[PDB]
Every structure is written in structure tokens, then in C-alpha cells.
Amino acid sequence: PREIEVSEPREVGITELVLRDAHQSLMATRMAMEDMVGACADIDAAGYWSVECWGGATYDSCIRFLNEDPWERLRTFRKLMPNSRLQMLLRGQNLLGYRHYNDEVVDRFVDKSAENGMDVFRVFDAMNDPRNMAHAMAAVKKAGKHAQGTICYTISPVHTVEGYVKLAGQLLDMGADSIALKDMAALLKPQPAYDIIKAIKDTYGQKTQINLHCHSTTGVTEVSLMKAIEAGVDVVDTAISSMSLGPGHNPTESVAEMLEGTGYTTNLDYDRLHKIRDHFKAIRPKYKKFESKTLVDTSIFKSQIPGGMLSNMESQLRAQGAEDKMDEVMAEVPRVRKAAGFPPLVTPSSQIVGTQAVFNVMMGEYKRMTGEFADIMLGYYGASPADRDPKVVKLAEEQSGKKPITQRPADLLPPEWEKQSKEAATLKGFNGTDEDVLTYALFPQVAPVFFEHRAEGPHSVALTDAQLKAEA
């Protein structure tokens, strides 16, 4: 017999993800505002620490598929849930866009987000480079909001508990009000969850607020949440049960109920949770055309490849002809990842590494490198967790003609707000607000079409009751 030290009896906070990450992960971010507003009053009174409802891929989805202004959605959520802490996911210097922006664009985006109601900003970087998060977080502090620095969890030869403890320290040094451990691929197992949370708390103090964000893709993370709570985690992210599991998240009600008698508890109102659950249970069937077909996939623990990346490369192998080389492409991913400095395999790094892996198997090793892969190797996306392969770096410079850099990429970007503002002002439909200039700066190719059709009002791409009933 042995013993395990566990935290003192206490309340654990819960962050609800149904309005953002749950539908992004389970139904391609297609959830229409019309299908969510009806649950806002109950969500607002359920007792959550925060409600994630903006950022991530929802900005793109609003203007590209739902003809909806993302800023109007944020204003509506602020109005319908006046007593809640609203939370968003922001990818640092890239904001919600496709590239790094000059510091002034980051300042304006954060300022308008805060002005329109955002309370908690979860700032992250796909390569875990703190320098890419530094300016956005300073802007959040300037706005007087809560800055949550994020650490993307991954498994690799260079990622260790000591490495995560070091990263947490760098985030606290740049003003983070809290630290978020983000496990998008559900790779965080129970013992590592306990060990990392405990090491951060022991090193920086019990006052260090840590929020754990785990998906349920591999089926092991609800046990990780329990171990994280024993290690002292302050808040855990979950999704209402009718919109949970699979590539999504662990169920809110299940996480609350499992704590009975352990000394830990949540302050969630079960009656409100039941109403929220029933609300989405009635709406989810309309999104069947966008659902995934796998509830549990643990293959990543061996292959390091997330199912979303795997099927993606598979489509590239068929449309290319030789798909009988899938087993070869999978053995190549680890090699490419290593060459790139072992970055976490989350969007967009995953698509980039996967594509380069397919190219190496097709036209030979680094014979043809995508422009994005070349940029990673040359440092235009920031620093990697480990040193990149000098041999491959050299090849990237000889194919791109760009010189390798090691300093924060945005240091080289010139002011661009005036240029963005002038170009945006020439599009039919532009309403003159900084919000619209931001939409143009973030999605130049979609902004034109959106501005022209926005007046029609938001639409839904979900099946109608008639179509649903017509299918049965």
C-alpha cells in the first residue's frame, strides 16, 4: 500500500464550451445563433466560472457560411448573459486570422473585443512560443480584462513536466492572470495531468490559477480531469451532455456528478443544466450532415497523428492516385515533425506537417516544400519547442530565397491599419466601423462577399424540421 497526496476539499470551477468549442469540434462550427439564444438565460444562471462563446473558428464560420456578423453575435451574447464571464480563444499575434499581424492590429482587435463585452481572453500559440502571445496579453491587461496564457499540451521527445513548468513561468512573467493547459488532441493522460498541475502549483504557489481544457477524443481525459482536481486545478472545461464526447469534450453534468462524496464539488445548478441539455438535444439532430463518425480513437498514442490530420492526408493520397503509400506517409510525419522542432500537432501546424509529409513520400524528401512549411523552417511562425534541423533549414532558404530569422516575426511587420482601413472602405456594404475593418484584415477574401449579403440577415445551413422529418 502506497499513498497519493490530494488537494483540500474545495469547489472546482467549470467553464461551459457548448456555445463555441463544442459545435466547432462536433459539427464543423455550423451552429446558428438562432439555435443557441434560447439557452442563454439558463446558461447565465447555471453557475459556470466562464462561458466560452467567441473566437476560435467561429468568426470565420459566421461570415463564410452563416452570413452572420461575429460582432453582432458577441453583442447578443453579452446582452443575454449579463451576469457571466464571457470567454474567447485568441491565437496570439495571428488573432483569428491567417497570418501574424502588426502590433497595432492586435491592439485594436483586443480593444474592440473588450469594448463589446469579452471578459476572459485565452491567448495561445500553436508552437507554444510565448513571444507570439506577449503583445495580445498586454493589450488584454490594458483593457482591464482577464488574460489567460495558454500552454498547448503534446507528447514528444522534448516535452517534459519541467518544460511545461518553465512555460508557465514565462506566461506569468508576461502578466497572465491564469494559465490554461490546452489538450486539443486529448493526449493528456491521468498521471501526467496530476504531475504537471502539481509541479506548477508547487513551483509558483497555490494562488496560481490553472484552467484545464481537454477534449475527449481518446476517451481517457475524464479520468485526467479527476486527477487534475486532486492535483489542485482551479477550473475545468466541459460541454453540456447532449453536445459532448467524441472529438468534443467530457460532459458537464457527468463531471459535476462524479465528485459527490470526494470532498470536491461544483456550484452548478442541476435544474438549469437539465434545461440546457434538453435544449441542445432537440437541436443537434438538425446538424447531422456535419457530424463525425468516430467516438473514441486512441491510435494517436502510438502514431502521434490526430484523426483529423490522418483522414486529411488520406484524401490527399487518393486525389493524388497512390494512396497505397499511406503507411509510408504516417512513418514520415514523425520525421517531418522532428525536423520542424517538434511543434504540437494542432491547427495549423498539423495540416502543414501532414502536407509536407505527403510531399516527401511523393516527390522525395523535401524535394518540394510548401510555402507554409518553408516559413516554419525559416522561423516566420516563431521559435519551435526544439531546434529545427539545420540541413532542412538550409534547403528551405534555397527554395524560398528568404533568410532564416529567430526573433519575433511581428518585429518585422510595418504599420498596416491605415492601409486596411482604406481598402475596406472601398467594399460595398462596409459599415465604417473598426469592427468591419478587422473583418477585412482577418478575412480579405470573404469580407467582400459578406459585406454585400450581410443585410439579408443570418442564415442556417442545418436541416429544417421539414427536411429532418422528411428524412424519417
Residues 230-289 that bind Co ion (CB under 5 A): none
Angle (CA) 13 142 130, round 5°: 70
- d(Cα 303, Cα 310) in Å, to the nearest integer? 10
Q: Per rule CB under 8 A, is residue 299 in the interface with its own copies?
A: yes
The entry of Co ion, its own copies, none that residue 192 binds, CB within 5 to 8 Å by partner kind: its own copies
Of the listed pieces 139-147, 245-253, 322-330, 396-404, which binds its own copies according to CB under 8 A? 245-253
Toward Co ion, which CB reaches closer, 21 or 125?
Answer: 21
Supply 369's cell numbers. 516544400
* C-alpha torsion angle, residues 286, 62, 53, 232 (rounded to 10): 90
The least CB distance from residue 41 to its own copies, in Å, is 21
Toward its own copies, which CB reaches closer, 4 or 455?
Answer: 4
Q: Per residue in 344-375, is it b (16+ CB within 10 Å) or e — as a string? A: bbbeebbbbbbbbbbbbbbeeebeebeebbbb
Residues 179-208 as x/- pattern, contact with Co ion by CB under 5 A: -----x------------------------
Toward its own copies, which CB reaches closer, 191 or 464?
Answer: 191
Q: Is 432 exposed, middle or buried (0-12, 13-18, 19+ CB in 10 A)?
A: exposed
Residues 135-194 that bind its own copies (CB under 8 A): 189-192
Instruction: Tell me the binding residues for substrate.
Output: 20-24, 57, 182
Among 82, 98, 289, 295, binds its own copies (CB under 8 A): 295
Q: What is the DSSP string of 437-471?
A: HHHHHH-TTTHHHHHHHGGG-----SPPHHHHHHH
DSSP 8-class letter at 84: S
Among 76, 209, 254, 399, binds its own copies (CB under 8 A): 254
Q: Per rule CB under 8 A, is residue 465 in the interface with its own copies?
A: no
Chain center to CA of 222: 19
Residues 216-235 as x/- pattern, contact with its own copies by CB under 8 A: --xxx-xxx-x---x-----
Among 7, 12, 19, 21, binds Co ion (CB under 5 A): 21
- d(Cα 39, Cα 84) in Å, to the nearest integer? 13
Toward its own copies, which CB reaches closer, 2 or 391?
Answer: 2
The least CB distance from residue 27 to Co ion, in Å, is 14
Residue 385: name the closest of 179, 160, 171, 210 by CA.
Answer: 160
The least CB distance from residue 214 to Co ion, in Å, is 8
Among 207, 302, 391, 428, binds its own copies (CB under 8 A): 302
Angle (CA) 452 455 457, round 5°: 120
Residues 388-427 as x/- pattern, contact with its own copies by CB under 8 A: ----------------------------------------
The least CB distance from residue 159 to its own copies, in Å, is 14
The entry of Co ion, its own copies, none that residue 21 binds, CB within 5 to 8 Å by partner kind: Co ion
- d(Cα 189, Cα 305) in Å, to the nearest integer? 16
Tell me the one-letter amino acid at 180. A
Among 147, 245, 376, 442, binds its own copies (CB under 8 A): 245
Q: To 10 degrees, what angle do helices 221-230 and 190-204 make?
A: 30
- d(Cα 321, Cα 151) in Å, to the nearest integer? 39
Question: 401 to each of 280, 368, 374, 396, how far by Cα in Å?
Answer: 52, 14, 10, 8
Q: Per rule CB under 8 A, is residue 7 in the interface with its own copies?
A: yes
Toward its own copies, which CB reaches closer, 65 or 204?
Answer: 204
Tell me the one-letter amino acid at 304. Q
Among 158, 270, 452, 453, binds its own copies (CB under 8 A): 270
Q: Per rule CB under 8 A, is residue 469 in the interface with its own copies?
A: no
The least CB distance from residue 250 to its own copies, in Å, is 8
Phi, psi of 31 (to 5 degrees): -55, 125
Q: Per rule CB under 8 A, is residue 244 in the interface with its own copies?
A: yes
Footprint of its own copies (CB under 8 A): 1-9, 189-192, 218-220, 222-224, 226, 230, 241-242, 244-245, 250-251, 253-254, 257-263, 270, 274, 281, 294-299, 301-302
Footprint of Co ion (CB under 5 A): 21, 184
